Design an enzyme around this catalytic site. Sequence first.
Site, PDB file in Angstrom:
ATOM      1  N   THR A   1      36.623  38.131  34.626  1.00  0.00           N
ATOM      2  CA  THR A   1      37.737  37.852  35.551  1.00  0.00           C
ATOM      3  C   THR A   1      39.177  38.119  35.189  1.00  0.00           C
ATOM      4  O   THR A   1      39.341  37.862  33.973  1.00  0.00           O
ATOM      5  CB  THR A   1      37.693  36.435  35.747  1.00  0.00           C
ATOM      6  OG1 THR A   1      36.432  36.218  36.660  1.00  0.00           O
ATOM      7  CG2 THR A   1      38.672  35.796  36.918  1.00  0.00           C
ATOM      8  N   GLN A   2      39.691  38.966  36.009  1.00  0.00           N
ATOM      9  CA  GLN A   2      41.262  39.338  35.683  1.00  0.00           C
ATOM     10  C   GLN A   2      42.086  38.737  36.995  1.00  0.00           C
ATOM     11  O   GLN A   2      41.598  38.444  38.117  1.00  0.00           O
ATOM     12  CB  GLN A   2      41.389  40.757  35.267  1.00  0.00           C
ATOM     13  CG  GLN A   2      39.974  41.477  34.645  1.00  0.00           C
ATOM     14  CD  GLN A   2      39.367  41.967  35.843  1.00  0.00           C
ATOM     15  OE1 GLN A   2      38.930  41.295  36.885  1.00  0.00           O
ATOM     16  NE2 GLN A   2      38.990  43.008  35.784  1.00  0.00           N
TER      17      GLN A   2
ATOM     18  N   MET B   1      30.952  39.502  36.327  1.00  0.00           N
ATOM     19  CA  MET B   1      31.847  38.609  36.609  1.00  0.00           C
ATOM     20  C   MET B   1      33.204  39.308  35.761  1.00  0.00           C
ATOM     21  O   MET B   1      34.227  38.764  35.133  1.00  0.00           O
ATOM     22  CB  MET B   1      31.659  37.244  35.948  1.00  0.00           C
ATOM     23  CG  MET B   1      30.697  36.402  36.780  1.00  0.00           C
ATOM     24  SD  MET B   1      31.202  36.289  38.389  1.00  0.00           S
ATOM     25  CE  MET B   1      32.679  34.991  38.311  1.00  0.00           C
TER      26      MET B   1
END
Lengths: 222, 195, 195, 211, 225, 195, 195, 204, 233, 125
Positions: free
Chosen positions: I1-2, I107
């Site tokens: 996730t970013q 993810m």
Amino acid sequence: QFNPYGDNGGTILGIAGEDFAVLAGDTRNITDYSINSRYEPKVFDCGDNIVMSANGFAADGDALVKRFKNSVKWYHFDHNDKKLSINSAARNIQHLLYGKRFFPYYVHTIIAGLDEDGKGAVYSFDPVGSYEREQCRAGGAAASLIMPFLDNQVNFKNQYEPGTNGKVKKPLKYLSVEEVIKLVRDSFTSATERHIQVGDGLEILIVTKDGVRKEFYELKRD
Amino acid sequence: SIMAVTFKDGVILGADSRTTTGAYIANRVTDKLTRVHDKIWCCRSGSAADTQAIADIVQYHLELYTSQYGTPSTETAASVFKELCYENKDNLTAGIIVAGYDDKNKGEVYTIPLGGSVHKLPYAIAGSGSTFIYGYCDKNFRENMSKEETVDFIKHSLSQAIKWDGSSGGVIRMVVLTAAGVERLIFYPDEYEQL
Amino acid sequence: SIMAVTFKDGVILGADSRTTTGAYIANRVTDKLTRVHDKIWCCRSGSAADTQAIADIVQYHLELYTSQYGTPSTETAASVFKELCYENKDNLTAGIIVAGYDDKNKGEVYTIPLGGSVHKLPYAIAGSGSTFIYGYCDKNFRENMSKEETVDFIKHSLSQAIKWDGSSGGVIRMVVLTAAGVERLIFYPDEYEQL
Amino acid sequence: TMLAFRFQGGIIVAVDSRATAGNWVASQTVKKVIEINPFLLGTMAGGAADCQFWETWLGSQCRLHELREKERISVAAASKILSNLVYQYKGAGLSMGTMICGYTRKEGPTIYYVDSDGTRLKGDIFCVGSGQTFAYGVLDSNYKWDLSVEDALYLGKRSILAAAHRDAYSGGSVNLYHVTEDGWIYHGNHDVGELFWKVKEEEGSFNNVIG
Amino acid sequence: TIVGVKFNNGVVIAADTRSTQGPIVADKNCAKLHRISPKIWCAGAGTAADTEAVTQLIGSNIELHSLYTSREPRVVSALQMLKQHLFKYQGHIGAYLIVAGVDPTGSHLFSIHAHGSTDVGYYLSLGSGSLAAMAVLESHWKQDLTKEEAIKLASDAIQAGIWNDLGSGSNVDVCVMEIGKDAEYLRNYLTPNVREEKQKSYKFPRGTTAVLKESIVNICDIQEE
Amino acid sequence: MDIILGIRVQDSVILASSKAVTRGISVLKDSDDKTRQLSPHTLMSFAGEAGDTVQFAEYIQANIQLYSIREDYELSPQAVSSFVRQELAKSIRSRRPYQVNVLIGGYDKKKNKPELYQIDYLGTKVELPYGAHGYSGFYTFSLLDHHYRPDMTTEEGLDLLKLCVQELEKRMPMDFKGVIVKIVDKDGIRQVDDF
Amino acid sequence: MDIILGIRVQDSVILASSKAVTRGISVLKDSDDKTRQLSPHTLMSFAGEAGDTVQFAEYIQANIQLYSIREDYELSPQAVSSFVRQELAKSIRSRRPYQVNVLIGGYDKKKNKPELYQIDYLGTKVELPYGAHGYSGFYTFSLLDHHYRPDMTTEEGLDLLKLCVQELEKRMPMDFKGVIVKIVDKDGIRQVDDF
Amino acid sequence: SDPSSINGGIVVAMTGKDCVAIACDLRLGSQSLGVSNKFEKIFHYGHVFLGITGLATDVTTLNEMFRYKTNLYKLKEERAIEPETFTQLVSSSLYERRFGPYFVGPVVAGINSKSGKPFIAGFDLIGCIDEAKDFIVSGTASDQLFGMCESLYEPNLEPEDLFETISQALLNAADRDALSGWGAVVYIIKKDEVVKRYLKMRQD
Amino acid sequence: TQQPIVTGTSVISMKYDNGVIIAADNLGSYGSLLRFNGVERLIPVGDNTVVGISGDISDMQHIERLLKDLVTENAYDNPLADAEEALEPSYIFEYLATVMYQRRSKMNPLWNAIIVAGVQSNGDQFLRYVNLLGVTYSSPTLATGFGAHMANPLLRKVVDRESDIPKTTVQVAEEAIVNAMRVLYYRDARSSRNFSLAIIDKNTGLTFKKNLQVENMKWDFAKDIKGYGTQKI
Amino acid sequence: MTDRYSFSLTTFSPSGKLGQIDYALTAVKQGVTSLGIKATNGVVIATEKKSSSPLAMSETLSKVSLLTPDIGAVYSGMGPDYRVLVDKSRKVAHTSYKRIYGEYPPTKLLVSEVAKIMQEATQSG
Ligand SMILES: [Cl-]
Ligand SMILES: [Cl-]
Ligand SMILES: [Mg+2]
Ligand SMILES: [Mg+2]
Ligand SMILES: [Mg+2]
Ligand SMILES: [Mg+2]
């Protein structure tokens, strides 16, 4: 935070006849209040006289269908080109779905075809693999609008025979393919009126002993 | 406040010397112009630990590159920086400007912002204080400036960045990269504040 | 991007015309230069609802002031703005620049940032896009400029602010306040972008 | 709502048929009884998929046992395979409430309550699900060891009906099973929409309702 | 989707007719064009009860004001009264309005947002389908539009919303306010979404439903004698 | 508090209410009467948050007793239940609502009929043949749905009530220390001292 | 589960453990034996989170039975308690700890002495004359502090245990459906079938 | 937690030829627990009928409130209130509680005594009027009712046919909702006679 | 996730009778700062495909390299690399679509919205969309971000359904695309005046136009707009 | 300050007369004649525009006033009192009726509201 899930809308419907089965679905694909496509096929011919649709999050739906089609291919390789029965396909899909029990395919899956006695069959799945053979099942966005109508007009629920006043039920007479298609079209026309994610087009796949046939109908584009 | 500017004879890197922990100036004479190769340097902004660790790793990669394949290009150096910044973007806070001089390619400038993307440019500005001089630098930059003009351009630009940005201050350090060699310049407050 | 600049003959207010809801430009031809009195105008930044409500209340106060005590000063107008912005600071998001012309005091500029404080200045800049032209405006501003010079100063300054700030754009509106009267100016993209 | 109780004539198993997603009635024709083999039954409550998947899996383990050991698996061993499995997944979010019911020579009629929390309990009477409390009321006041297969079957049917009426997340129809020394015996699907009015007229019960 | 378009001798506003609760369509033929005064009309988006209530209140006070001053009401009066009311309630009254009309001062067109900010323009659009509508307005709008051209542009902007925005649908309502004329309210100006005939009739046989009891309900008052 | 039950038979209303008063990890009292006589032929049992229950009951009691004296007349159970409902319906939108659920058992001397009303803290009134509040109904309604007939005798009502209490004592986790039973009929209110 | 008590008298250890198994709102069972025989002269009662309790007890049981067969010898209660403590002390820093509290009652045949060990889920071991887990000790330790003498007979221990259970039945809110009592002495382990 | 779905219930109204119909279920519950199977949701004030779904305390409260207001209306006006006028009264009354609303879904049904025109209307919990020609739905199974009504309904139905349509719309929609059912009532309304029918349905 | 840092806005595209058109502005935004003014977001693959990418630019540059590497890899031991076994649009899309969905399933997505426009071997038009979620769809018109809300409505007036495609010429289609780009410049706060446009025709091949500008803009009417309601001066 | 007249200025005299009401009626008697006639298909109200000066523009003074679209009013007595009553009558038609029922009040009920306002001036402090 990254949300790996999304909602592509749509609505699907499977009805099992006496010697046929139908699997219908609208062709609209959406995110939020925008239309992505007015014609994005959702119901697929997977071979061996089985039709399938995984409604909900299209990315997971396309992945599942793709993996099941693959399973049919390998079933032929591994078991001397044996035909995959609808009951066997259903169980196989349970394992595909439950294989991702802790990171689910966010889809309501339905398959339709014929059982080994030649009778019409529809199987319904939840996102994590629970399944059940049914005579009638709508899935997706407008499922809540359609199923009650099908309880009433397919299984004759709450309907009784005039003169008896609630004593004698309406007999469960079988429906023809032409009668089922009328109920499917009226279901989707009604769903289109009251559900914003339903519209554009209706594609129906009909399964008989002769094979898989397709029918397309326009729906309101607003 | 950091910047790198290409000109006729090559490229010049410029930077302030302020390191802050909140509003406390932890170091007022910091050297943010760091050498990864003889004529390939970088300007560092963001986490001092992250940017040092990155620069050290890059210097190691280019030292090993040189031992096998000879002098690397400035583009190659930027790619090594990018690879570290892109692949470790979740755990890093580094805004780096890579500047170098070849004889074939002459002065080149690559900027690598937070995401890890690479952008080749005639000149680049970065750091918290860069925001205040976007207008000035865009209006006053010209291609193929002289050494003296480019020094004045950087000096004036960083002077304003320092003036407005509390995170920036101290001395203005500069590093000149040309065929002639490597020249270090320094400019003190009394000089650049009166500009 | 808004600014007000005093010069020899009086004062000039300048502004962009962009109103945004996130990244959607809700209005691309907005008038952020609003009149609270014949020769006392203001530049509005922040909440469009808050700044309109404030300006309407101020215009009412100065209309009532005029009926009793005659023409108010620009300082007085700024004080009315301040009183509203300071006392309702918890519930407001308004960054206003007040500019006006007296015959006695000539051109004056007051800026009122978020807190509600007042600052009398030779010129003022505000809005999200002002950040990018602190360096340019500080370097290029002179006192007692001519009308034509001041128009060019504002035009060039807001051009850069528009160039870099996504929240700013459209046309550059200007309002000239002198003894001669009130003059409205407008400058379109094709004109100011090529500067 | 699902129950199971031991008595003179073996075991009675009775379940409802409803499945919900919030207030939405997803299905009224669910099979909450699992025919593991000719002597074992499994009841399903909680997560539909979890119960289905792992109880059909249990049947594969029971089949492998009697292939390897040339002997029918005990109800104790069968139940413990399931409980040991779900215990491995403890914390992961499985949701199961199950009764493993069967008859063997060494044990006689036996019922085990197995739970996704890892709980494994042997007992004479169990009621599980959102409508378990309603079923317990009828069962506890009418239960005896000396019940005829006919009367026991009715009590189980009636106890589900009681819960189908009051519990919003129970209903549809009643599936009956009777487990004896010679295996289990299915005793039909009973629609609540017809059973309620029938039971109301014959029993004289549910007077609060008008019909 | 609601729009407003100025023209030569007046102003026109238009709107779609869909109301939604989530993904469900509550009403297929909703009336989003409200009358503040005879020649001042506004279109409303956002919370339905709020657009109605705030319009009625200001319309009531405008009528009383018109009677008090012996003058026909002005659009700037409705604009000022609406914005000050909405501002006071800090956006909690979810009314997003396009206010238009003609008065002794001339023809006017304004927008109003829930927090109380107002905007002036020759062409405006609001609601979830405002981007689809504004795209059409930005492509086809010009200065010195005729009445016939403005109605066309306005309804085309609404259609863009109907088709491309899921929050908008059904029919197009229009209201034309020209200087020196009666305002003409064109309810269901366009009807491009009539439902096709159903395949089947679902009229039941009489006696199909099971009944327990029957009784006459006494709606009349207590009787004489 | 915990369990309160009600059952309306042929010629009377029977209310059963638990005796336990648990305050944390301790059962403080095992002989608590969770009921108040509102009028000679009207009884109200109650259960909810501590303090609020008794405060509400006694407040209602006082109001009905005041009415009785003023008019020299006993209000019908229906009238009393409506008064109580309105107080709770008023209460739910107060600064601090009464967190009290009640059963009102009364004998209407005009109609010669027993009447049982169930009202929750929201002000939700329903007339019932038998009722309960909290988790009591979950166990008891199945038994009542089964053994209750509207022409039952007070003795049969008590036997059916014993069946309910026995089931609760078997399956409920909390020890509620038995119940106090009270009968409301044409002759007034009396307590069954052996249960 | 809920209440588990232990008392070490002259020549034996007595363990009392509740019979109730409550799952949420209902009591699913009222005859549950919350204990396992680890060896002929060692008994362990247990209480904690559902599933974990039995899983842990049977795991310990298996390990001790394995030891008995391998060495043809019964471990001392002290040795068994130390083994159990270490398993729990290992468990508390695991991915998912065993949420189980235990009492270990044993008769050491070498020393001819009864021994009672109290161990909580953290691996906190203490040898005691009498012990309890959960809220049981809050009521019972005051009685045991008063009526406990180290030269008590098994019959006197049972009488003192009855006084503990009576107090718990009076003051605890939860109905724990009585206790199963077991005695551990030189002759082994036996259950008191009437209590 | 969600006030509109604690007690559960539904209401549906339809127009026919010179007639209107309004129907409701009889269930009142506390979430999963069924409490009463005689909690009617349709009331009438003269010849105007009002159905109310949602939180039961508010259903009862509003009924008492509109009885209060329509009784005073009649004393002053010297005539019974009409459906169109009552609809505006309901809207007004609800919106006055804009920021502390009654958690209900009212449905007005009736025939104008002077014009003879059939009238139905629906509202949200804060007063927005939905004046539909065909039908109005409300409650926990409103989605289901929308689907049933949209497919079953056809205009200009005779009273005895309209009864069958609305009855089947309610019944089959309630059977797909956990919080609806436990009985049902249907009012068939004509200009000067009203028939009330209790329906036989599944009690689960 | 970013979270995306340097971003690219709308990518718009449509089919016409003999091929497809795609376009995207040359801006790389850094939040509200219009940081980079010379970013090419249309990346051609061979002479029959153009991939238009919006969203995170560092991820775009990564995808750009994957495509470059894809061409290299396809040429290996492939005598028909410039003929029958050349990369098709459908091959390139499906590859990206696989990568996108794999990354979302780990993810750790590539924060992009991609449109692959091209012409197949048999002359068929190819136009399909994929994004960070691995969601895919095709339509006669496709657009990302703001383009979805503003461009599609305009482009759908030209090609509303499949049967309108043979009736639409390249001049009409390009005109619609260029108009849509202007509209987005009026209304998107993260757009630039400068943009690139690409045409892939089954007859004339790949035409790649750089350094295009939005022209014929309407602003004159701004002079008449004064205040926000009551103000006259 | 504060209005310290919280007591009635109209009171019963020994004979049972309410003096201020009688005197108000005397003021009405001095006022210019106005009349009203009801027909089968309409009503007419009329009065004389008694101009106080020929330099005064009597069109600006409206003795006959619209209250609602279907209700009108005319008076005899003190003009200023009439003017404020019309203002209140117009407002009460909205606040106590139109904003509740969405329609204009019937004549008798609007009259009732006006009457109420006039009664209160006969009893209030
Ligand atoms: Cl450093
Ligand atoms: Cl503004
Ligand atoms: Mg500084
Ligand atoms: Mg639409
Ligand atoms: Mg301890
Ligand atoms: Mg039920």
